[PDB]
Amino acid sequence: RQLWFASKQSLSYLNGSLPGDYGFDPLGLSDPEGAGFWFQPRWLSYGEVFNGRTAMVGVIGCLAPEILGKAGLIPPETALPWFKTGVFPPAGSYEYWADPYTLFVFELGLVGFAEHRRYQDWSNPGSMGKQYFLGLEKGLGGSGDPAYPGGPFFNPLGLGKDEKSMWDYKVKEVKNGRLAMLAMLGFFVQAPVTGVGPYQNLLDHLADPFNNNIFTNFKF
Amino acid sequence: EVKILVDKDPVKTSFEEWAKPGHFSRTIAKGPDTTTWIWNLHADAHDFDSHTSDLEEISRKVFSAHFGQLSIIFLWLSGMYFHGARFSNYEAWLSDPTHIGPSAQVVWPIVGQEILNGDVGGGFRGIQITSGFFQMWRASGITSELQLYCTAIGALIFAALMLFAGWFHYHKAAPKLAWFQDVESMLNHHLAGLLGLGSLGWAGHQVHVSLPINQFLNAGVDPKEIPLPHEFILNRDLLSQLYPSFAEGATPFFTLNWSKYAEFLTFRGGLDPVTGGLWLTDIAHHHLAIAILFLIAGHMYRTNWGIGHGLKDILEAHKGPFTGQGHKGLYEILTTSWHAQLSLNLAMLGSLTIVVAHHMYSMPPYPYLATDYGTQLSLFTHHMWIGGFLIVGAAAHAAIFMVRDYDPTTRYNDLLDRVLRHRDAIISHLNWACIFLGFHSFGLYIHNDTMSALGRPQDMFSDTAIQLQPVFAQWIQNTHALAPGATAPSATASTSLTWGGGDLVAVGGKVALLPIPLGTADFLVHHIHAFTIHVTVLILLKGVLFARSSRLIPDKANLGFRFPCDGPGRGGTCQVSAWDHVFLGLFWMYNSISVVIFHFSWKMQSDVWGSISDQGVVTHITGGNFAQSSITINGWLRDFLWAQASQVIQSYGSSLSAYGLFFLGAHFVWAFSLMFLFSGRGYWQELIESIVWAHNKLKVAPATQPRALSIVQGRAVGVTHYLLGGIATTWAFFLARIIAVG
Amino acid sequence: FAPDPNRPLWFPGSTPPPWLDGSLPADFGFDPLGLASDPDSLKWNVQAEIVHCRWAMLGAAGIFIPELLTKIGILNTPSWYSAGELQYFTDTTTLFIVELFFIGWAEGRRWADILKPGCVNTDPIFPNNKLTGTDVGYPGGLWFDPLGWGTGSPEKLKELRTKEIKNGRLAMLAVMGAWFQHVYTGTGPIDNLSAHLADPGHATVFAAF
Amino acid sequence: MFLISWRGYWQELIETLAWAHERTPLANLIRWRDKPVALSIVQARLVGLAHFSVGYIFTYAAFLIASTSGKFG
Amino acid sequence: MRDLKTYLSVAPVLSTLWFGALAGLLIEINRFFPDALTFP
Amino acid sequence: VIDYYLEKSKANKELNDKKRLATTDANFARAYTVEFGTCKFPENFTGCQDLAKQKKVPFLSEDLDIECEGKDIYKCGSNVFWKW
Ligand code: CLA
Ligand code: CLA
Ligand code: CLA
Ligand code: CLA
Ligand SMILES: CC(/C=C/C=C(C)/C=C/[C@@]12O[C@]1(C)C[C@@H](O)CC2(C)C)=C\C=C\C=C(C)\C=C\C=C(C)\C=C\[C@@]12O[C@]1(C)C[C@@H](O)CC2(C)C
Ligand SMILES: CC(/C=C/C=C(C)/C=C/[C@@]12O[C@]1(C)C[C@@H](O)CC2(C)C)=C\C=C\C=C(C)\C=C\C=C(C)\C=C\[C@@]12O[C@]1(C)C[C@@H](O)CC2(C)C
Ligand SMILES: CC1=C(C/C=C(\C)CCC[C@H](C)CCC[C@H](C)CCCC(C)C)C(=O)c2ccccc2C1=O
């Protein structure tokens, strides 16, 4: 197996049993000895997969309005950089049907109902297929693996029937999650340095590459 | 290998042990039979190594106690910011800091106490504060009361966070002993992480929020029209007008053209004439350099990769023909004894606090701090007292380590062994030094007093008589005054105005700082200081060195660290424990610090502080009477104690009336302590025997049998009351004098 | 009223505390602070919740029914928030003292019931008039249960009591809601409801800055 | 000093001075004839009380005589 | 619950509650009946 | 630029002095509300600061009104909201 900056400590517990395993753990965060709460091997893999899943959607969320508005698809005023949509009021904001602080409460309620239910699966595997939830609990029983629930809702197409395809898909998903993680970190770093959006940054670089980079942008 | 090591749910969270007082110790948990129990519960509350012999269990307890202390400190800071935001005249003081006295406490109108709301100016009535918070807030760029409210809310949130962290790390995730003993990682993180990153962040705040707002303030623009701090980050153009170099961005930093940042990163020295404090451009550069120095320092030790040092390796390689094996064995001692680490850290912190006190008056960092005499005197005295107390605690805990954790069979060290093998020579030499210094310092004062009383002023030790000039300190002053020209060419002015550069800084018709002259009187007080410091060192070192055994008591270790005596035998064996030595050394620390603060007060009021007119004439508070009057004890009695106490004794019926009341109360408590210090418990137990009879006659005798205080407890009560009364007397007298006349 | 270990919980997937068993009506396993750990504390708290629920139900009716009819015009009652400072046939102090006397007699007899169950079921003046209730908190009789719905099967009784407890909890929330809404908005509750229904995206708490 | 500090501290300190004298050249030629010991427990109380009383009497005598003789009432 | 009530019955907690109530009572009496030298 | 904000402060000296007087007077009267009779038992169910914007208490409302005046929408340092 290909190893990227491994160690004796890393290879003791990183044995290839997890998808996207390259023995990379310089700081020993996944060591099973004396591990609990936030720093345990089973919470960290779930956190990696979950964070990659949100980052994968977030990259498209940031890139879609700016790309569509650079074409003639969506109205210009709805095509904004991700930091000018109201998420960062100093950089500008948009006027929606509801106040942003009222939208925050609605999102808080919905997302809380989702995430507390997600957590009770981790803290109690089969718990959420038992109590009445308007009949949806029939498909919210989990699978015993917190990051891979499956079922009628979360895996409706029923892909990865055999083990060899499920493992390959898990590898691809963790790899794309890592790549989108890096992409969103790049977005966050580029936003203050260069005052424009990621797509404008891309276009301005393949127009005159030697005058649009970090070396030039050590001025803002 | 260095890794996180925790234990899950070690102690269950329940109220059952709250209902059982004394649960932490075997003896106390059984309940009380006499009143002594009630005291024993409070004296052993935090003596964790006496509760259990497990090092891990003790370490977890101290780790959570630190979180509790941090929560209390955050609550205190939140209260200070909230009172600044809600009950203060800060916004009026900002527009006129030279004519308005800071105030952040307002009393209620009850039982006539509303007289304490005095005229501090700015259309405000309150109590004048001497903490210096107003100048620090002005330096930080704080301009409105809203930003203080947000700071109070944040400090409350942080206090809640620390309390939750303490509970979580004692009851849910308790770190193992190996985690605590990872000293290399702790040193690396505290040097690079805490200090380096903290100073870097503060430097960023200063170059982004402090420098521009203070430039606007020092230019004379209204605080309510200064742009908000974030406006100096949003449009960089506002920042490119005060300093055009900001137009270049971070390109000069990465291309190594640092002189392009000379506008806001300077090496000036001296004081800002408009402000009377250190240049903010100097302070930002200081913090930016300190950040780099500490970030590089925090990379010295080896944690998980090959690079770095081993502390044990460094210790074991330092030995010589006079010191045997050297420092070998010290790593084992300092990684298994909490008391030795506490002793070392207490000594270093107490020494650093005194340095802070000395440096803050000579180089006022905050704006309008030098001309606020009440704040300067209060800060100096406060930090001197804190340093002295921490230094005494260092000796106490070194003695505790010697009594309990010392073990030559398993934790031998050559240096400590060799020190214990010639302690007689050390103690006798320090005794001789103390006697010599006491004579040649205090007896000169007696000689001067007798010569003055005999009508022979020409036979005294004075500047107009037999001279004793501090030539070495004068040479150091002259050398530091010439530094900008030869030894610090890049510096524009000397590091302080007191070295002798022949300039004075005046702010609002008041003298900030000027060259401080040294003469015979200073020669006298400095040796007085040295004598008292040496006596305190003698008392504490004799207790530390002779704690385990002496020729009188071969087995003093079996008696413990804190015991009254070993009986009236051998002529009398009172106060032979190491605890008594701390009890005695507290008095001498008090004496030394009192003399130091008296010296500071008189010198500042006589030769530095004062007023300046629009002619060029300086008039000091006491008119330069220190040189000719501070050389006799009668001079201190008359021109300092009698003359300057005239304020606190005529403060009745004014806003300063609370200081005379505290003056009398402190005198009363100081006198009260002498009952405990001069007597013994055998008389008091016999006296209690008669009162118990009177109670039994009326069937009101309590089941908890009344006991006189223990021999050690009476000493503790006496010394605590003595120190409280003494320190409060000076607190009230100093504050009244410097608020009325300053 | 038997144990119910499979009842719906306030926090699905959690474990109810051992003292919260399921025999009491309207039990969802909600006691995170352990306020009812002792059996005596639970006995006292059940009665406290019952009386709070009933008082808040009466209060919710008295605030919300008259103020809805004012907005329709069937009535012209004043605002509930300031109805206490108006002038009546007597000053407020003597009204409060008379209420203290009457309600104190009633509450003292209820206290005697709580401390000793049988104790006060009989008329002090006319020995033949008795309260037919059996459990504490449900006095029964012709005075407190004229229609006889208070007694019945041990299965319909549990749901009849659960409805009361849940309605009382809702009214308890609603009374404080109306109070704080009047404090922070300066107008009536039905005005608040209509304004929020007109502009749900903006007419909320955050519409104060 | 005599009323606050007690004997054992002083005895343990006198032991070191005895060693220092016994080890100092040109001073070994001189020997004490009575062994130096600290003051007794009762002796120290008496000495401290005597100093306290003498200071108490002299301070007030000086103050009274000087204050009544500066102005003669 | 029982243990917490036992803890609140300990001497220092009861003492601070009692003296706080006493201080409040005396303060309010002095606020509404100030400057009393005699008993009319 | 400094000598532009000096011009700005010259034209608004009186207005800023009236802000300072109001904000210090409110800070002092916060300790005297009950004696004055402005914020007490039946109306102090919440803060006297909360009562300042719903009842017009004498001294804690002048500060609220004067606090931001002549300032823009997002440039009053004493109120985050001001003109929202
Ligand atoms: C070290 C921190 C610290 C310190 C020393 C102070 C000190 C002070 N604050 Mg303060 N404060 C702080 C932090 C601090 N605060 C923080 C963090 C906040 C933000 C929440 C505040 C918010 C604040 C406000 C809003 C006010 C003060 C006020 C005051 C002053 C009067 C306080 C008083 O009388 O208590 C009030 C009395 C009590 C709290 C009672 C003590 C309770 C103990 C537990 C005993 C309980 C017994 C009880 C009283 C008896 C009845 C019980 C019942 C069962 C019968 C006083 C100078 C007041 C002031 O200056 O007025 C001009 C004021 O209005 N503070
Ligand atoms: C860069 C990393 C870092 C930082 C910033 C700190 C900072 C601190 N440590 Mg620390 N520590 C570290 C790494 C670090 N440590 C490591 C790696 C070890 C193991 C070898 C330890 C072991 C250790 C012990 C055993 C003790 C400390 C203590 C302290 C505090 C000293 C008191 C003080 O100066 O108040 C400064 C106060 C502040 C700066 C206020 C802000 C508080 C900071 C920001 C919180 C620190 C968060 C922490 C680094 C990570 C949080 C974990 C995360 C899951 C939330 C201080 C907060 C002492 C203490 O007081 O314990 C509570 C103590 O007894 N540390
Ligand atoms: C961070 C510093 C620090 C820490 C962690 C400790 C920790 C400890 N010390 Mg220590 N100490 C310190 C600083 C420190 N000390 C300093 C600075 C001194 C010099 C004064 C001492 C002197 C000292 C002695 C002499 C002894 C200890 C002892 C102890 C241990 C038991 C403590 C205990 O149960 O107290 C319980 C706490 C109390 C009984 C509370 C006392 C209250 C004080 C006296 C009142 C303070 C006045 C107050 C500020 C004013 C209030 C006014 C009033 C009207 C309200 C414990 C390990 C004892 C021990 O056996 O160690 C093993 C012991 O004999 N220490
Ligand atoms: C003002 C009162 C006072 C004075 C003068 C002293 C004096 C002394 N104490 Mg001390 N002490 C006091 C109060 C005082 N104490 C109190 C209240 C306490 C309780 C906390 C202590 C606790 C204490 C301890 C715990 C220790 C001392 C020590 C010392 C000695 C330090 C060495 C020194 O300076 O010798 C020089 C002598 C003097 C300064 C005395 C004045 C002499 C002048 C010059 C006049 C002499 C002229 C001439 C000889 C007269 C001869 C005339 C002829 C007719 C007789 C010294 C004898 C330390 C010690 O013994 O170390 C050596 C020590 O360890 N003391
Ligand atoms: C989750 C995430 C981002 C999610 C973003 C979302 C939902 C964005 C949403 C929005 O855009 C839209 C949709 C629309 C906008 O209008 C609103 C917002 C809200 C703006 C990024 C994670 C980003 C996570 C990142 C970048 C993590 C990086 C971690 C690294 C590199 C760690 C490496 C190590 O830990 C190892 C591997 C081994 C150790 O031993 C050594 C070290 C080195 C410590
Ligand atoms: C909200 C409330 C109680 C809330 C308590 C809660 C949530 C406690 C929760 C917890 O403890 C548990 C459950 C479990 C613990 O482990 C956790 C916590 C969280 C600690 C009571 C309100 C109770 C509210 C009540 C009883 C209100 C009654 C109102 C009346 C009678 C009004 C009458 C009037 O309005 C009219 C009718 C006409 C007007 O003109 C005149 C007046 C008089 C104003
Ligand atoms: C005065 C004195 C005493 C007597 C002092 C005692 C016993 C202090 C204890 C009494 C105080 C007042 C505590 C008693 C108060 C109760 C804890 C609570 C009382 C209830 C209310 C009044 C609060 C000694 O025991 C003693 C021992 C050794 C050397 C010197 C001395 C010494 O000087």
PDB file of all heavy atoms in Angstrom, chain A residues 9 26-27 31 33-37 218-219, chain B residues 1 3-6 8 172 236 249-251:
ATOM      1  N   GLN A   9       4.249   4.797  14.881  1.00  0.00           N
ATOM      2  CA  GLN A   9       2.995   4.939  15.609  1.00  0.00           C
ATOM      3  C   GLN A   9       1.792   4.843  14.682  1.00  0.00           C
ATOM      4  O   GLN A   9       0.798   4.196  15.024  1.00  0.00           O
ATOM      5  CB  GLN A   9       2.981   6.264  16.367  1.00  0.00           C
ATOM      6  CG  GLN A   9       1.678   6.560  17.083  1.00  0.00           C
ATOM      7  CD  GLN A   9       1.580   8.003  17.528  1.00  0.00           C
ATOM      8  OE1 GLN A   9       2.276   8.874  17.009  1.00  0.00           O
ATOM      9  NE2 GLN A   9       0.712   8.265  18.496  1.00  0.00           N
ATOM     10  N   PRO A  26       0.700  12.103  11.088  1.00  0.00           N
ATOM     11  CA  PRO A  26       1.924  12.535  11.785  1.00  0.00           C
ATOM     12  C   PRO A  26       1.717  12.856  13.254  1.00  0.00           C
ATOM     13  O   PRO A  26       2.614  12.608  14.070  1.00  0.00           O
ATOM     14  CB  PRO A  26       2.351  13.778  10.991  1.00  0.00           C
ATOM     15  CG  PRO A  26       1.719  13.616   9.661  1.00  0.00           C
ATOM     16  CD  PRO A  26       0.408  12.949   9.920  1.00  0.00           C
ATOM     17  N   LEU A  27       0.558  13.398  13.616  1.00  0.00           N
ATOM     18  CA  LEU A  27       0.331  13.834  14.987  1.00  0.00           C
ATOM     19  C   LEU A  27      -0.285  12.748  15.858  1.00  0.00           C
ATOM     20  O   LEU A  27      -0.486  12.976  17.055  1.00  0.00           O
ATOM     21  CB  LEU A  27      -0.556  15.080  14.989  1.00  0.00           C
ATOM     22  CG  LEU A  27       0.163  16.415  15.191  1.00  0.00           C
ATOM     23  CD1 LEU A  27       1.403  16.500  14.322  1.00  0.00           C
ATOM     24  CD2 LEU A  27      -0.769  17.562  14.872  1.00  0.00           C
ATOM     25  N   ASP A  31      -4.776   7.477  17.411  1.00  0.00           N
ATOM     26  CA  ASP A  31      -4.214   6.418  18.236  1.00  0.00           C
ATOM     27  C   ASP A  31      -5.288   5.856  19.161  1.00  0.00           C
ATOM     28  O   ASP A  31      -5.961   6.624  19.862  1.00  0.00           O
ATOM     29  CB  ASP A  31      -3.035   6.945  19.051  1.00  0.00           C
ATOM     30  CG  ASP A  31      -2.088   5.845  19.482  1.00  0.00           C
ATOM     31  OD1 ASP A  31      -2.469   5.037  20.353  1.00  0.00           O
ATOM     32  OD2 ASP A  31      -0.960   5.787  18.950  1.00  0.00           O
ATOM     33  N   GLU A  33      -4.963   4.185  21.894  1.00  0.00           N
ATOM     34  CA  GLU A  33      -4.584   4.126  23.298  1.00  0.00           C
ATOM     35  C   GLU A  33      -4.953   5.420  24.012  1.00  0.00           C
ATOM     36  O   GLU A  33      -4.497   6.504  23.642  1.00  0.00           O
ATOM     37  CB  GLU A  33      -3.086   3.859  23.432  1.00  0.00           C
ATOM     38  CG  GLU A  33      -2.590   3.835  24.866  1.00  0.00           C
ATOM     39  CD  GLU A  33      -1.082   3.931  24.961  1.00  0.00           C
ATOM     40  OE1 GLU A  33      -0.407   3.729  23.930  1.00  0.00           O
ATOM     41  OE2 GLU A  33      -0.572   4.212  26.065  1.00  0.00           O
ATOM     42  N   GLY A  34      -5.777   5.296  25.050  1.00  0.00           N
ATOM     43  CA  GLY A  34      -6.212   6.446  25.818  1.00  0.00           C
ATOM     44  C   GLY A  34      -6.999   7.448  25.001  1.00  0.00           C
ATOM     45  O   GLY A  34      -6.779   8.657  25.110  1.00  0.00           O
ATOM     46  N   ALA A  35      -7.923   6.959  24.180  1.00  0.00           N
ATOM     47  CA  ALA A  35      -8.679   7.788  23.248  1.00  0.00           C
ATOM     48  C   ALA A  35     -10.139   7.816  23.682  1.00  0.00           C
ATOM     49  O   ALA A  35     -10.701   6.781  24.057  1.00  0.00           O
ATOM     50  CB  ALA A  35      -8.541   7.262  21.822  1.00  0.00           C
ATOM     51  N   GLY A  36     -10.747   8.998  23.636  1.00  0.00           N
ATOM     52  CA  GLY A  36     -12.150   9.136  23.967  1.00  0.00           C
ATOM     53  C   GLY A  36     -12.786  10.400  23.427  1.00  0.00           C
ATOM     54  O   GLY A  36     -12.099  11.266  22.879  1.00  0.00           O
ATOM     55  N   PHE A  37     -14.104  10.510  23.595  1.00  0.00           N
ATOM     56  CA  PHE A  37     -14.894  11.666  23.180  1.00  0.00           C
ATOM     57  C   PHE A  37     -14.580  12.127  21.762  1.00  0.00           C
ATOM     58  O   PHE A  37     -14.876  11.416  20.798  1.00  0.00           O
ATOM     59  CB  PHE A  37     -14.696  12.812  24.174  1.00  0.00           C
ATOM     60  CG  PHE A  37     -15.067  12.452  25.583  1.00  0.00           C
ATOM     61  CD1 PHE A  37     -14.144  11.858  26.425  1.00  0.00           C
ATOM     62  CD2 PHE A  37     -16.345  12.685  26.057  1.00  0.00           C
ATOM     63  CE1 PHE A  37     -14.485  11.516  27.716  1.00  0.00           C
ATOM     64  CE2 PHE A  37     -16.690  12.346  27.347  1.00  0.00           C
ATOM     65  CZ  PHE A  37     -15.759  11.760  28.177  1.00  0.00           C
ATOM     66  N   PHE A 218       0.523  39.570  -2.997  1.00  0.00           N
ATOM     67  CA  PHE A 218       1.063  39.940  -1.689  1.00  0.00           C
ATOM     68  C   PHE A 218       1.006  41.461  -1.569  1.00  0.00           C
ATOM     69  O   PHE A 218       1.977  42.132  -1.213  1.00  0.00           O
ATOM     70  CB  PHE A 218       2.489  39.430  -1.522  1.00  0.00           C
ATOM     71  CG  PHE A 218       2.585  37.957  -1.255  1.00  0.00           C
ATOM     72  CD1 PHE A 218       3.658  37.222  -1.732  1.00  0.00           C
ATOM     73  CD2 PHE A 218       1.611  37.306  -0.516  1.00  0.00           C
ATOM     74  CE1 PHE A 218       3.753  35.867  -1.485  1.00  0.00           C
ATOM     75  CE2 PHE A 218       1.702  35.950  -0.268  1.00  0.00           C
ATOM     76  CZ  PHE A 218       2.774  35.230  -0.753  1.00  0.00           C
ATOM     77  N   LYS A 219      -0.168  42.014  -1.866  1.00  0.00           N
ATOM     78  CA  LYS A 219      -0.355  43.459  -1.874  1.00  0.00           C
ATOM     79  C   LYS A 219      -1.708  43.810  -1.268  1.00  0.00           C
ATOM     80  O   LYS A 219      -1.956  44.962  -0.896  1.00  0.00           O
ATOM     81  CB  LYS A 219      -0.226  43.993  -3.303  1.00  0.00           C
ATOM     82  CG  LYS A 219      -0.309  45.505  -3.440  1.00  0.00           C
ATOM     83  CD  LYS A 219      -0.614  45.910  -4.875  1.00  0.00           C
ATOM     84  CE  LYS A 219      -1.716  45.049  -5.477  1.00  0.00           C
ATOM     85  NZ  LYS A 219      -1.430  44.697  -6.896  1.00  0.00           N
TER      86      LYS A 219
ATOM     87  N   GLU B   1       6.435   7.993  23.135  1.00  0.00           N
ATOM     88  CA  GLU B   1       5.685   8.797  22.178  1.00  0.00           C
ATOM     89  C   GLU B   1       4.753   9.776  22.885  1.00  0.00           C
ATOM     90  O   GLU B   1       4.178   9.461  23.925  1.00  0.00           O
ATOM     91  CB  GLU B   1       4.886   7.898  21.234  1.00  0.00           C
ATOM     92  CG  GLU B   1       4.504   8.563  19.924  1.00  0.00           C
ATOM     93  CD  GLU B   1       5.632   8.547  18.912  1.00  0.00           C
ATOM     94  OE1 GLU B   1       6.598   7.779  19.107  1.00  0.00           O
ATOM     95  OE2 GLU B   1       5.554   9.304  17.921  1.00  0.00           O
ATOM     96  N   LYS B   3       1.382  11.626  23.047  1.00  0.00           N
ATOM     97  CA  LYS B   3       0.021  11.513  22.539  1.00  0.00           C
ATOM     98  C   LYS B   3      -0.957  11.803  23.667  1.00  0.00           C
ATOM     99  O   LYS B   3      -0.609  11.763  24.848  1.00  0.00           O
ATOM    100  CB  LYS B   3      -0.236  10.130  21.931  1.00  0.00           C
ATOM    101  CG  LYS B   3       0.082   8.971  22.853  1.00  0.00           C
ATOM    102  CD  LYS B   3       0.799   7.870  22.100  1.00  0.00           C
ATOM    103  CE  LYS B   3       0.668   6.540  22.809  1.00  0.00           C
ATOM    104  NZ  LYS B   3       1.130   5.416  21.953  1.00  0.00           N
ATOM    105  N   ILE B   4      -2.195  12.102  23.276  1.00  0.00           N
ATOM    106  CA  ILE B   4      -3.257  12.371  24.238  1.00  0.00           C
ATOM    107  C   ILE B   4      -3.618  11.072  24.946  1.00  0.00           C
ATOM    108  O   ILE B   4      -3.886  10.051  24.303  1.00  0.00           O
ATOM    109  CB  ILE B   4      -4.481  12.980  23.545  1.00  0.00           C
ATOM    110  CG1 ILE B   4      -4.105  14.288  22.852  1.00  0.00           C
ATOM    111  CG2 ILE B   4      -5.600  13.209  24.545  1.00  0.00           C
ATOM    112  CD1 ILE B   4      -4.908  14.559  21.604  1.00  0.00           C
ATOM    113  N   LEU B   5      -3.624  11.105  26.276  1.00  0.00           N
ATOM    114  CA  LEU B   5      -3.962   9.939  27.088  1.00  0.00           C
ATOM    115  C   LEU B   5      -4.973  10.382  28.134  1.00  0.00           C
ATOM    116  O   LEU B   5      -4.657  11.217  28.986  1.00  0.00           O
ATOM    117  CB  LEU B   5      -2.718   9.343  27.744  1.00  0.00           C
ATOM    118  CG  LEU B   5      -1.744   8.613  26.823  1.00  0.00           C
ATOM    119  CD1 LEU B   5      -0.520   8.154  27.597  1.00  0.00           C
ATOM    120  CD2 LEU B   5      -2.429   7.437  26.152  1.00  0.00           C
ATOM    121  N   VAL B   6      -6.185   9.835  28.068  1.00  0.00           N
ATOM    122  CA  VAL B   6      -7.268  10.210  28.962  1.00  0.00           C
ATOM    123  C   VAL B   6      -7.898   8.947  29.541  1.00  0.00           C
ATOM    124  O   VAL B   6      -7.693   7.838  29.051  1.00  0.00           O
ATOM    125  CB  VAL B   6      -8.336  11.075  28.261  1.00  0.00           C
ATOM    126  CG1 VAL B   6      -7.721  12.354  27.716  1.00  0.00           C
ATOM    127  CG2 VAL B   6      -9.017  10.285  27.160  1.00  0.00           C
ATOM    128  N   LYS B   8     -11.859   7.698  30.868  1.00  0.00           N
ATOM    129  CA  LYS B   8     -13.259   8.066  30.722  1.00  0.00           C
ATOM    130  C   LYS B   8     -14.023   7.832  32.017  1.00  0.00           C
ATOM    131  O   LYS B   8     -13.922   6.767  32.631  1.00  0.00           O
ATOM    132  CB  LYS B   8     -13.905   7.262  29.595  1.00  0.00           C
ATOM    133  CG  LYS B   8     -13.229   7.410  28.247  1.00  0.00           C
ATOM    134  CD  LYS B   8     -14.155   6.973  27.127  1.00  0.00           C
ATOM    135  CE  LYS B   8     -13.608   5.753  26.406  1.00  0.00           C
ATOM    136  NZ  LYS B   8     -12.126   5.797  26.280  1.00  0.00           N
ATOM    137  N   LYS B 172     -15.186  13.593  33.220  1.00  0.00           N
ATOM    138  CA  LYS B 172     -15.431  12.896  31.965  1.00  0.00           C
ATOM    139  C   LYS B 172     -14.146  12.416  31.303  1.00  0.00           C
ATOM    140  O   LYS B 172     -14.001  11.221  31.030  1.00  0.00           O
ATOM    141  CB  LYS B 172     -16.219  13.801  31.009  1.00  0.00           C
ATOM    142  CG  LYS B 172     -17.379  14.525  31.664  1.00  0.00           C
ATOM    143  CD  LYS B 172     -18.523  13.575  31.971  1.00  0.00           C
ATOM    144  CE  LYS B 172     -18.867  12.707  30.777  1.00  0.00           C
ATOM    145  NZ  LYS B 172     -20.064  11.870  31.044  1.00  0.00           N
ATOM    146  N   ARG B 236      -8.779  49.846   2.885  1.00  0.00           N
ATOM    147  CA  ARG B 236      -7.396  50.059   3.293  1.00  0.00           C
ATOM    148  C   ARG B 236      -6.945  51.486   3.019  1.00  0.00           C
ATOM    149  O   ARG B 236      -5.913  51.921   3.544  1.00  0.00           O
ATOM    150  CB  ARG B 236      -6.489  49.059   2.577  1.00  0.00           C
ATOM    151  CG  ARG B 236      -5.334  48.543   3.410  1.00  0.00           C
ATOM    152  CD  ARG B 236      -4.024  49.146   2.944  1.00  0.00           C
ATOM    153  NE  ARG B 236      -3.808  48.954   1.513  1.00  0.00           N
ATOM    154  CZ  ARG B 236      -3.597  47.783   0.927  1.00  0.00           C
ATOM    155  NH1 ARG B 236      -3.540  46.659   1.622  1.00  0.00           N
ATOM    156  NH2 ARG B 236      -3.428  47.739  -0.391  1.00  0.00           N
ATOM    157  N   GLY B 249       0.982  46.842   0.879  1.00  0.00           N
ATOM    158  CA  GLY B 249       0.517  45.522   1.271  1.00  0.00           C
ATOM    159  C   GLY B 249       1.592  44.764   2.023  1.00  0.00           C
ATOM    160  O   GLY B 249       2.381  45.343   2.777  1.00  0.00           O
ATOM    161  N   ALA B 250       1.627  43.447   1.821  1.00  0.00           N
ATOM    162  CA  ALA B 250       2.577  42.569   2.490  1.00  0.00           C
ATOM    163  C   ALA B 250       3.785  42.248   1.617  1.00  0.00           C
ATOM    164  O   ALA B 250       4.604  41.401   1.986  1.00  0.00           O
ATOM    165  CB  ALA B 250       1.887  41.280   2.933  1.00  0.00           C
ATOM    166  N   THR B 251       3.908  42.903   0.464  1.00  0.00           N
ATOM    167  CA  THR B 251       5.043  42.710  -0.432  1.00  0.00           C
ATOM    168  C   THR B 251       6.371  43.069   0.233  1.00  0.00           C
ATOM    169  O   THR B 251       7.341  42.315   0.083  1.00  0.00           O
ATOM    170  CB  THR B 251       4.861  43.521  -1.719  1.00  0.00           C
ATOM    171  OG1 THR B 251       3.481  43.509  -2.103  1.00  0.00           O
ATOM    172  CG2 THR B 251       5.697  42.934  -2.840  1.00  0.00           C
TER     173      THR B 251
END
